[PDB]
Design an enzyme around this catalytic site. Structure first.
Site, PDB file in Angstrom:
ATOM      1  N   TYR A   1       2.584  20.270  21.224  1.00  0.00           N
ATOM      2  CA  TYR A   1       1.315  19.942  20.603  1.00  0.00           C
ATOM      3  C   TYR A   1       0.210  19.962  21.642  1.00  0.00           C
ATOM      4  O   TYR A   1       0.453  20.076  22.845  1.00  0.00           O
ATOM      5  CB  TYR A   1       1.379  18.578  19.923  1.00  0.00           C
ATOM      6  CG  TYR A   1       1.085  17.417  20.841  1.00  0.00           C
ATOM      7  CD1 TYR A   1       2.008  17.008  21.788  1.00  0.00           C
ATOM      8  CD2 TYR A   1      -0.101  16.703  20.729  1.00  0.00           C
ATOM      9  CE1 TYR A   1       1.747  15.940  22.619  1.00  0.00           C
ATOM     10  CE2 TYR A   1      -0.371  15.639  21.553  1.00  0.00           C
ATOM     11  CZ  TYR A   1       0.559  15.259  22.494  1.00  0.00           C
ATOM     12  OH  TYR A   1       0.300  14.192  23.318  1.00  0.00           O
TER      13      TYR A   1
ATOM     14  N   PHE B   1      -7.854  16.549  25.810  1.00  0.00           N
ATOM     15  CA  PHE B   1      -7.354  15.376  26.499  1.00  0.00           C
ATOM     16  C   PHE B   1      -5.841  15.355  26.595  1.00  0.00           C
ATOM     17  O   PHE B   1      -5.304  14.486  27.283  1.00  0.00           O
ATOM     18  CB  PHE B   1      -7.854  14.086  25.828  1.00  0.00           C
ATOM     19  CG  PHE B   1      -7.295  13.847  24.461  1.00  0.00           C
ATOM     20  CD1 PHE B   1      -7.845  14.471  23.354  1.00  0.00           C
ATOM     21  CD2 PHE B   1      -6.244  12.970  24.274  1.00  0.00           C
ATOM     22  CE1 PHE B   1      -7.338  14.249  22.092  1.00  0.00           C
ATOM     23  CE2 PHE B   1      -5.733  12.742  23.011  1.00  0.00           C
ATOM     24  CZ  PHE B   1      -6.283  13.384  21.920  1.00  0.00           C
ATOM     25  N   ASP B   2      -5.143  16.261  25.920  1.00  0.00           N
ATOM     26  CA  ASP B   2      -3.716  16.442  26.125  1.00  0.00           C
ATOM     27  C   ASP B   2      -3.333  17.821  25.629  1.00  0.00           C
ATOM     28  O   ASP B   2      -3.879  18.314  24.639  1.00  0.00           O
ATOM     29  CB  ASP B   2      -2.874  15.388  25.405  1.00  0.00           C
ATOM     30  CG  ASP B   2      -1.457  15.328  25.931  1.00  0.00           C
ATOM     31  OD1 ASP B   2      -1.161  16.027  26.920  1.00  0.00           O
ATOM     32  OD2 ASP B   2      -0.631  14.591  25.361  1.00  0.00           O
TER      33      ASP B   2
ATOM     34  N   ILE C   1       0.914   6.303  18.587  1.00  0.00           N
ATOM     35  CA  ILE C   1      -0.027   5.545  17.768  1.00  0.00           C
ATOM     36  C   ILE C   1       0.116   5.862  16.283  1.00  0.00           C
ATOM     37  O   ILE C   1       0.770   6.837  15.898  1.00  0.00           O
ATOM     38  CB  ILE C   1      -1.471   5.805  18.227  1.00  0.00           C
ATOM     39  CG1 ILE C   1      -1.962   7.154  17.706  1.00  0.00           C
ATOM     40  CG2 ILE C   1      -1.553   5.773  19.736  1.00  0.00           C
ATOM     41  CD1 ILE C   1      -3.402   7.437  18.034  1.00  0.00           C
TER      42      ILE C   1
ATOM     43  N   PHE D   1      -5.612  16.462  16.511  1.00  0.00           N
ATOM     44  CA  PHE D   1      -4.403  16.996  17.109  1.00  0.00           C
ATOM     45  C   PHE D   1      -4.112  18.390  16.575  1.00  0.00           C
ATOM     46  O   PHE D   1      -4.785  18.901  15.680  1.00  0.00           O
ATOM     47  CB  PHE D   1      -3.233  16.054  16.847  1.00  0.00           C
ATOM     48  CG  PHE D   1      -3.353  14.748  17.554  1.00  0.00           C
ATOM     49  CD1 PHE D   1      -3.534  14.709  18.921  1.00  0.00           C
ATOM     50  CD2 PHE D   1      -3.314  13.560  16.850  1.00  0.00           C
ATOM     51  CE1 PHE D   1      -3.652  13.503  19.582  1.00  0.00           C
ATOM     52  CE2 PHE D   1      -3.435  12.353  17.500  1.00  0.00           C
ATOM     53  CZ  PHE D   1      -3.605  12.324  18.868  1.00  0.00           C
TER      54      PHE D   1
END
Lengths: 107, 412, 625
Positions: free
Chosen positions: A26, A36-37, A56, A99
């Site tokens: 992902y 951020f990821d 989360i 995401f």
């Protein structure tokens, strides 16, 4: 109970059951497209376990609505996210953690 | 002059004290490096001894009063002789840095007023002076690092927030973080709370594949039409998915400049560009990416067909995929120059063209690109208007510019 | 005219159907001769990188002309502006083969004309300021007839080769590297003692051509009279009353994304609006663009877009009230219902004006200031030094993007086909949003330096083992970004060393010092494999036995689980043998070129080539790899 839109349809019926290693690859960016990821970057298939309260609640809710081969735009809510606290250093308060996931295998 | 006035204030040292202030600065001047190494120390020893004799007579406090009593106005008095207020204040900080730079003994007994100093950090008349006082006191004593607290740092970052960009202010935070040898952790976690998560003030950095577009040598103004098809996508060879956008664009506007203005180049992110094609097919029209759906949510897979059209005398752009409706959106545009297919891509990708050599077409909108080759004009798909051209010997030059279906009779 | 074959203009269509109109006019001409009435009778400048400007030598290159027109080929000081075109100052030093006049602040007759297919050749002395031009071996001569081209200039900041294209012109250059293409360098050149631009070099030479697109700048002193003034009440005035009064396009510094207002007071034609950064129209016109909805059935399908630039037209006291969405106000009256469609769009404040009088502005239901900067108690309007009064300038040099793509094409269905990806390396200022690629900063020293000190801060925040913040930066710098940024052979020298520092201070320090502490302890167990050490070859310190204690590696993956007291232990992880394989390549790659001793080397000097290259290799030597 969050906005989930299927990018690429998998099959739908493959519901992820509790007690399975959900191997995903992902990424995810901020409201302004600021990354951020990216698990694609570090070449790591991120694996996690449902119901154990690992990731989360936005990701935990959107993980159940998917299936195998299904890409999805988990456009999460700041209240379901880290909130008005945020992640201290990475994520500011009140963000939309958009995401971009892809399931690979289960257990 | 803290009173009303006297109009005959003979006590006015301006030219005398400014002369001595340019005289006191060189009296504390550091020695140059291009010097005999023994003569460097003997000058240095006289320097370090010189500062300590000013310290016990408390000159730093006596300097600091004159900064206080000149922290009154913002440009005053009889303003012809007092016109040089910018000099005397700014030169007073440059003196004050000279009484500091080397001595730990002079820094620690000074220290005590950084909380006074950053209070005055908002004045912004000679802040680079009062920054410089702060930079030397921090590096020279690890005592004063354990006095500056969080509210001082929030005022420090905010001055970087207002005043653009400075490597000088970053040299503060690099020295505020790590001491002589030790790394005080309470300042480090304080900084990443502030500077990092906003992505607001520093310069964020990324990398994405190179984007290039194409054109089939032919300008386009009946109801004009073309067709496209896809063979191999392979969407993930990056830390990113690839992109696929097809559409129309102008010709007298937006020279094809990759990623010096808009992000990475792209397709549809300029106003002259009007692209389409997505998984969940929605658009790009001048940095817009809004999410108008389609009744398949279908991919750009390895087999699909693209039907694109625009009618004559009607700024009405809508496309089709496999002959299926997309609920078109694009209306109300302008013309200056003609149009063309602007297929873009960034992958190990391969696609077809359908020109004639057609495979599939829906009817509505009846003027294919096969109609646009009537008189003489040829057809060669190229790299979209090409301010560059790629080669192997020498990628050579190409000039700036060389420049209607309603012909004009003379009214005779 | 419905299946019409006459949807074609005259100059292109079939030229035999016009012969029915041509010969009918010729029989109308055959009558007229029978009746006695016989029917009797911008530019595109190419400069190189500024750091290639030689100052001592006899340097040569050649140019291959193809077409007709302005071919101003020669040399140049590095401070040549792109805008004012070539030769009309002391910054350029070239010669146009057309019109036979040499270029220094103007024109003066020199040499002979060009030929389609020439190879020019250009020769510089640097021991003396005597420049020369050649043409196909034949030396272009003066009015008095000498071999020189120019005389008694200044070797200051070196000299850079620049060609200037005309309007529809095509040229071809060479800078060494092309030993088969040295056309007339054999005859004059080597036999005069001259040097190409690959006497030792190994890379290419990236060029900075002038972009046709305009962008904005600050307000420097480059005018007769253009001036901005910072007055506090809280106003900014202007003036452009000169003999050059054409067009002024005024952008402001920072945008507004999606309460309070902002004023304008003009002393004397005027377009007020709001600009998003996708605006590069540079003319005097009134042009610009919406999109209707798609609502899953049709029949509603009305309104998405209003995105463009915005429009308005003693004292002109118009006020830009905004948010919510966009509105207008005009001198107390209401020209309201503005283009109120913006989800989160950037909005510069922006007015366009031209010179008719001086002092054309004075700037500024609460008050403004808070609505722009970060803090928002902040009721009174306050001016800040970040505010600039940006002018849309015509051109600046921009890099060639030296390696582009591997696109192919076909005909039978026209198969275009690619195989390999080529990635950018791009950053952006967020506060005045525009993307720049990393390998452009070699000429922007005021942004190279400030970004270099940003990397010094990232290396120092996660210094001496802060695995919380090193995990926070790993999601901020994203390690395969480094793995390209290690290997750019055109990256600046400071940003070379900064990225090598940042790779080590995230990943390869807290274990590296941890084995550096125990370097002198030598504790050992007495197990059986210890007994099999010979002490001697019948030496090699690369043995693999190593039965000491050697404190172990542990690592952690920078994920985003809610187990936040588990980053907390070791370090961010990294891929290991990807890194040690590239270094062994880059060691052999760097030492081979430096054994040829180029003029090039990677960071300008050989230090920036070698110093971080060894330092990453040295730290990796201790780490058990």
């Amino acid at each position: 109970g969050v906005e989930i839109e299927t990018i690429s349809p998998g099959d739908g019926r493959t519901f992820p059951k509790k007690g399975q290693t959900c191997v995903v690859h992902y990424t995810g960016m901020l409201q302004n497209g600021k990354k951020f990821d990216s698990s694609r970057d570090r070449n790591k298939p991120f694996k996690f376990r449902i119901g154990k309260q690992e990731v989360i609640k936005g990701f935990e809710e959107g993980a159940a609505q998917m299936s195998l081969g299904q890409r999805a735009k988990l456009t999460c809510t700041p209240d379901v996210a880290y909130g008005a606290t945020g992640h201290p250093g990475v994520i500011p308060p009140n963000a939309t953690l958009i995401f971009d996931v892809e399931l690979l295998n289960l257990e | 002059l803290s009173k009303k006035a006297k109009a005959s204030t003979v006590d006015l040292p301006i030219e005398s004290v400014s002369l001595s202030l340019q005289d006191l600065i060189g009296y504390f001047h550091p020695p140059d490096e291009h010097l005999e190494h023994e003569d460097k120390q003997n000058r240095l020893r006289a320097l370090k001894n010189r500062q300590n004799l000013f310290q016990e007579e408390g000159m730093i406090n006596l300097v600091l009063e004159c900064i206080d009593r000149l922290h009154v106005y913002s440009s005053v008095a009889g303003r012809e002789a007092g016109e040089s207020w910018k000099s005397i204040l700014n030169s007073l900080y440059e003196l004050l840095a000279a009484l500091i730079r080397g001595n730990r003994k002079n820094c620690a007994q000074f220290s005590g007023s950084l909380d006074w100093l950053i209070s005055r950090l908002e004045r912004l008349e000679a802040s680079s002076g009062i920054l410089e006082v702060l930079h030397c006191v921090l590096v020279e004593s690890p005592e004063a690092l354990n006095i500056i607290k969080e509210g001082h740092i929030k005022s420090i970052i905010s001055l970087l927030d207002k005043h653009g960009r400075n490597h000088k202010v970053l040299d503060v935070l690099c020295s505020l973080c790590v001491c002589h040898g030790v790394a005080v952790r309470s300042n480090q976690h304080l900084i990443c709370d502030n500077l990092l998560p906003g992505r607001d003030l520093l310069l964020q950095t990324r990398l994405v594949n190179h984007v290039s577009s194409m054109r089939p040598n032919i300008f386009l103004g009946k109801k004009w039409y073309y067709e496209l098809m896809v063979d191999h996508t392979e969407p993930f060879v990056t830390a990113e998915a690839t992109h696929l956008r097809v559409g129309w664009a102008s010709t007298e506007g937006y020279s094809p400049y990759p990623g010096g203005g808009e992000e990475w180049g792209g397709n549809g992110v300029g106003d002259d560009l009007f692209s389409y094609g997505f998984d969940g097919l929605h658009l790009w029209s001048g940095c817009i990416a809004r999410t108008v759906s389609s009744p398949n949510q279908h991919l750009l897979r390895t087999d699909d067909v693209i039907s694109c059209c625009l009618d004559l005398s009607a700024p009405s752009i809508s496309f089709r995929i496999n002959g299926q409706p997309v609920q078109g959106m694009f209306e109300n545009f302008n013309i200056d120059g003609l149009f063309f297919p602007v297929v873009s891509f960034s992958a190990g990708i391969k696609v077809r063209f359908l020109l004639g050599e057609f495979k599939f077409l829906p009817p509505p909108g009846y003027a294919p690109c096969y109609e646009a080759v009537l008189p003489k004009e040829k057809l060669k798909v190229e790299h979209s208007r090409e301010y560059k051209q790629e080669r192997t010997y020498t990628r050579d030059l190409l000039g700036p510019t060389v420049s209607a279906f309603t012909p004009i009779p003379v009214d005779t | 005219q419905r299946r019409n074959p006459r949807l074609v203009p005259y100059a292109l269509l079939d030229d035999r159907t016009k012969k029915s109109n041509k010969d009918s006019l010729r029989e109308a001409v055959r009558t007229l001769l029978g009746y006695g009435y016989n029917l009797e009778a911008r530019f595109r400048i190419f400069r190189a990188e500024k750091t290639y400007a030689v100052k001592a030598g006899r340097w040569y290159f050649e140019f291959e002309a193809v077409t007709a027109g302005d071919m101003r080929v020669g040399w140049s000081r590095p401070g040549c502006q792109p805008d004012q075109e070539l030769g009309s100052d002391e910054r350029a030093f070239a010669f146009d083969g057309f019109k036979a006049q040499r270029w220094h602040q103007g024109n003066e007759h020199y040499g002979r004309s060009w030929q389609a297919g020439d190879v020019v050749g250009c020769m510089v002395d640097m021991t003396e300021h005597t420049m020369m031009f050649t043409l196909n071996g034949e030396i272009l001569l003066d009015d008095s007839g000498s071999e020189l081209a120019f005389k008694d200039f200044d070797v200051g900041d070196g000299f850079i080769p620049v060609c200037s294209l005309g309007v529809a012109q095509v040229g071809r250059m060479n800078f060494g590297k092309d030993v088969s293409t040295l056309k007339y360098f054999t005859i004059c050149g080597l036999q005069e003692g001259y040097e190409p631009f690959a006497v030792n070099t190994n890379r290419d030479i990236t060029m900075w051509l002038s972009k046709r697109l305009p962008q904005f700048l600050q307000v420097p002193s480059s005018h007769e009279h253009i001036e901005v003034t910072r007055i506090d009440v809280t106003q900014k005035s202007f003036g452009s009353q000169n003999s050059s009064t054409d067009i002024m396009f005024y952008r402001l510094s920072m945008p507004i994304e999606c309460t309070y207002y902002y004023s304008v007071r003009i002393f004397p034609n005027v377009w007020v609006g709001w600009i998003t950064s996708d605006f590069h129209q540079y003319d005097t016109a009134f042009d610009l663009v919406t999109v209707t909805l798609g609502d899953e059935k049709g029949k509603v399908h009305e309104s998405i877009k209003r995105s463009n630039y915005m429009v308005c037209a003693n004292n002109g006291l118009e006020i830009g009230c905004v948010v919510g969405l966009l509105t207008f106000t005009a001198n107390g009256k209401d020209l309201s219902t503005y283009y109120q469609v913006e989800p989160s769009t950037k909005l510069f404040p922006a007015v366009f004006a031209q010179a008719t009088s001086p002092n054309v502005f004075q700037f500024e239901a609460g008050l403004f200031k808070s609505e722009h900067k970060n803090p928002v108690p902040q009721c009174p309007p306050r001016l800040h030094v970040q505010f600039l009064s940006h002018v849309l300038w015509s051109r600046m040099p921009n890099q060639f993007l030296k390696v582009d793509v591997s696109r192919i094409s076909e005909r039978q269905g026209w198969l275009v086909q690619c195989l390999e990806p080529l990635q950018f390396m791009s950053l952006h200022i967020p506060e005045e949003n525009r993307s720049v690629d990393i390998l452009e900063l070699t000429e922007q020293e005021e942004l190279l330096k400030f970004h270099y000190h940003t990397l010094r801060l990232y290396s120092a925040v996660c210094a001496l083992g802060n695995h919380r913040v090193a995990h926070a930066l790993c999601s901020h710098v994203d390690e395969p970004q480094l793995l390209y940024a290690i290997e750019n052979k055109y990256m600046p020298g400071l940003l070379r060393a900064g990225y090598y520092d940042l790779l080590i201070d995230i990943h390869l320090s807290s274990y590296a010092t941890a084995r550096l502490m125990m370097n002198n302890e030598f504790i050992v167990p007495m197990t059986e494999e210890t007994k099999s050490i010979t002490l001697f070859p019948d030496g090699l310190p690369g043995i693999g036995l190593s039965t000491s204690l050697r404190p172990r590696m542990q690592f952690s993956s920078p994920s985003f689980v809610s187990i936040n007291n588990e980053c907390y232990q070791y370090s961010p992880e990294f891929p290991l043998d990807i890194l040690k394989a590239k270094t062994i390549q880059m060691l052999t790659e760097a030492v081979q070129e430096g054994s040829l001793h180029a003029r090039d080397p990677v960071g300008g000097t050989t230090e920036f080539l070698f110093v971080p290259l060894i330092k990453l290799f040295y730290t990796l030597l201790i780490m058990g790899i």
